[PDB]
Design a protein around this nucleic acid. Sequence first.
RNA 1: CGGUCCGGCCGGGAACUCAAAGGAGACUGCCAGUGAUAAACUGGAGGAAGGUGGGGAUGACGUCAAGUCAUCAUGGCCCUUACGACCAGGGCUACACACGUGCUACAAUGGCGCAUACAAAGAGAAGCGACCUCGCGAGAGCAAGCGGACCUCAUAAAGUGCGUCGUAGUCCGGAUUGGAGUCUGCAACUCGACUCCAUGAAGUCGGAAUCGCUAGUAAUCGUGGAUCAGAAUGCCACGGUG
Lengths: 151, 100, 79, 99, 114, 127, 206
Amino acid sequence: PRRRVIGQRKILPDPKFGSELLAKFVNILMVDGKKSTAESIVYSALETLAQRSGKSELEAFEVALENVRPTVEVKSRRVGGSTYQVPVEVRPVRRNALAMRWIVEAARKRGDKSMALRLANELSDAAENKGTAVKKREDVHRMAEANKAFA
Amino acid sequence: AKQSMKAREVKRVALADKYFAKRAELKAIISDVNASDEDRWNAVLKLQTLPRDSSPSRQRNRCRQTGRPHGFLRKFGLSRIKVREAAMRGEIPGLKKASW
Amino acid sequence: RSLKKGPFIDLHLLKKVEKAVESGDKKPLRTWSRRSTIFPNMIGLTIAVHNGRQHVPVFVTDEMVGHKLGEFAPTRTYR
Amino acid sequence: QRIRIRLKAFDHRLIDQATAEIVETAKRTGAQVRGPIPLPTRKERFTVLISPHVNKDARDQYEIRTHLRLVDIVEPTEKTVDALMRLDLAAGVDVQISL
Amino acid sequence: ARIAGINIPDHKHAVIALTSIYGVGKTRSKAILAAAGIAEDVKISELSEGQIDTLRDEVAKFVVEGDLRREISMSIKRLMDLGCYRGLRHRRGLPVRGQRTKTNARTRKGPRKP
Amino acid sequence: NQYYGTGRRKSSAARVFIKPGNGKIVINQRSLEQYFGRETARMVVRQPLELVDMVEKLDLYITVKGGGISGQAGAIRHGITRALMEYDESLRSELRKAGFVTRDARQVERKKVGLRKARRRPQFSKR
Amino acid sequence: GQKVHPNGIRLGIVKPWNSTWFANTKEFADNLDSDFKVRQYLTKELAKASVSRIVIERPAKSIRVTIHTARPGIVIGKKGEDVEKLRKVVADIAGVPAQINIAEVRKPELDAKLVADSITSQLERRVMFRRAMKRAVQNAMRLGAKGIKVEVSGRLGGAEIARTEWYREGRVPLHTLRADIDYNTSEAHTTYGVIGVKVWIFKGEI
RNA sequence: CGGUCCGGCCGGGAACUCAAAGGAGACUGCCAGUGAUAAACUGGAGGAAGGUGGGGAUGACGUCAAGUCAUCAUGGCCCUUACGACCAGGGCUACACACGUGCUACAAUGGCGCAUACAAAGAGAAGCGACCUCGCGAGAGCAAGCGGACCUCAUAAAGUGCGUCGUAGUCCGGAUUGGAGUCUGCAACUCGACUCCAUGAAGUCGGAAUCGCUAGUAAUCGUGGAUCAGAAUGCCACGGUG
Ligand SMILES: [Mg+2]
Ligand SMILES: [Mg+2]
Ligand SMILES: [Mg+2]
Ligand SMILES: [Mg+2]
Ligand SMILES: [Mg+2]
Ligand SMILES: [Mg+2]
Ligand SMILES: [Mg+2]
């Protein structure tokens, strides 16, 4: 990425609802190249989340995503020996990508019986903004308002 | 390798075809037949009296020019170094630098 | 450890075990055969088994039958 | 009945040129000729260490391509059998006669 | 529940509950339930005293618990008094089977000390 | 006469035959559901029959050898589209846009000497 | 860095094999040692006879040795006098019957093996290496070579610190597979060690 | 298409998959924008492929008196009734420890049991060895085909379907050791691989620090090969999912 100015790989939509954002989500959860078992966990968590929150499977994801979606983040920059944290406005594409990544990482750190349950309860905590994932957007916010002078 | 280490292999081949090819094979198949002689054979004992070097398993595959006991290839009968040397001179038929 | 189809013993040592039974117990039997399985016809004898440099004399016992002669002659000095 | 010719050669532009000779000699002396049938090439690959001592990643990768050709002549005419038997073919091509 | 060697099996499935005895692994536990005419996917609940003693009589055939422990220890001491290589290593707390001692041999030696 | 189109992806090779009438799918003397245990692999073969309309308009006799689940399924997707152009040729425009005409040249990279895999390099040690 | 053998890399492209025979895994090793043993005999015997190349082909159960030489008269002898004594022992070494063919090397100053062997034989007569190299280069360029490169390595002229010296005239594109590059080695066994001669002759493209 | 033991299996058909020789094709060629009207870059059309399309082979003059006198070759030196040579046994496998490279883990994206869909590329006559039979098993006996697109190694595993375990040092994890064996080999004590029964360590995700990888890549899941009597978690290669 020094000289080469590349674009972004347009991935195929979801085989169930046809959502590109969900195709990003299944891949984020996916491990060891097991897409079959990855969508099986995402669909089982969506089936248990929409049922236990009042249908709208696309919208129940969107409510939990709006609370984890960050606006600003810090960028480590060494100017004069010292390392300065510069606050920078995140792009709409990465906004969702960071939001999805923290949902998966927080559900993995949970102690439930299954990943379909771990994901559902993390998506439930995010919908009401009171989980490990919303706190990762909170710590990112406190870091940005602090270094607000070096913007 | 050493001239003595090369000679030791010539002895190991000469004794491999003399006994363990036409005589010791006969007493080893006998020391396996369950149908005949289950206790009084002496074939296991008379196998010991035969020279040690006579066994085919006691032979080491060595580079047919240098005598190298390591990095041998049966296809050419030579070690990786002398294989490469002949390969580049086109002395090995149909052999060339492959890429896929 | 091996196939049940005959336990192994060296002919030069087996003939030395035979000669020691009929002519009576002598001094330690100097043998390098560490690969030979101990037979019941050995119990009571003193077989001097090699270790690489000296011959370790081992008094044969009934519980020693089935085991190799080289188990009772340490090969590596460790102190 | 039928005569089966199996050709083996490390060089390809030598096997089909010597095959062209067998097919033509047979069809000229009036015989039914099936093929030249191109059978799969056996690629015997070899990897040798290029350094006399140490240097594990430094290697030479070679192959021996063994080309295969099948020529089936249906009519065993005396004019064809004798024409094929007194044919001078490349010394680097092996010919297997199957009755 | 209480079978052969004083131990009190949990209220888990029959095959896993029987492995609790020292001398019965996965194979003996599958063969004991096949000989006594009991299912492997059934718990201790419903298994009456008439079904317990028939398994106790079945397991009594092979050396288990304290009886097996002394048998294992006897063969270890036998090698030790014999003076064999196999015995000299049970006496030195090092790998008997032939494994390397230059490095990784921590199960037998125990945890390291500088 | 039967409308033919060859399709391939990875080490999989699929042959597709088109005949009008019904919405039947026969893959290697088996049903569409019987062969593929995944619904994602079932939808990719249904993809050419979306832009170009079919519910019970035409039948397809298909056979595929080599590769795996997504490989075979991907190969069939390419075959149907090639058999579809064989039947009309004005369908090229709709088939380009969807990216089904293009043969996916992505093959597995060879293992290289000195490397653990195709690109995976063994762990480095400074001292 | 280290360079790829110019002959080896071009085998199949613009360069031919020295062994054309075919064999299965069964006798491939047995034939290869028989080839080494026959070349070894002939290089030792026909040393002063300017042997440039030796080609071995095995028609059925026979050996056909094609000796490429710049001096065919000395190799043949008095009406086949020398060919008969060679074939007789080639048949003995190989086991199968022998047939020796003699290929004339017209311009030997354009043959890598003969140029290299000439530098080697000169270094052993106590000639100055720089003169030997320049003479090899000049002779090759005046006879039509599109290019030449001659390299001599180790204890040059008896020196304690070994050097690697080279003379290059013309074009020598070692990266073009299409190019006809004739490459061969030779070793000069001097009173003060082994001196390695490497010669590259570019004859033209295609 | 004609005939069915429903097996391409037999007449046949040269259509197709494929096999392997020859040939076409992609060059910023076209269009548009940016740019000194240049070079080039960006985007688009067509196209199976687009800007060296993907991968490999190919490593300039030279640098580090960098590695190899133990592959071999070799100036000099040294031993030459010994630094040579033969043999048996032992050692290279020792074990207070330290570092580097790996494998296997710590589990429910998982363990186990049954059922089951889909590869690629290799190897083979002193060989691969089916089918059948015996043994829980490693194997063994008997014995076809095949020097091989025909026969054999050889059941791909991940995955999918159902059931079970339900956050537990556990139906996780397999070390270590006891008992009995199998095969190869003159011979498995030191010091082989594998099987069966029992044992069930540490480990519940790793401090400071640090490595690989930009796409069919990483991650994971099997498969084959060279060496090799036997002895792969190494190496070399192969496709699956991704
Ligand atoms: Mg020597
Ligand atoms: Mg050996
Ligand atoms: Mg237990
Ligand atoms: Mg082509
Ligand atoms: Mg280039
Ligand atoms: Mg140095
Ligand atoms: Mg387990």
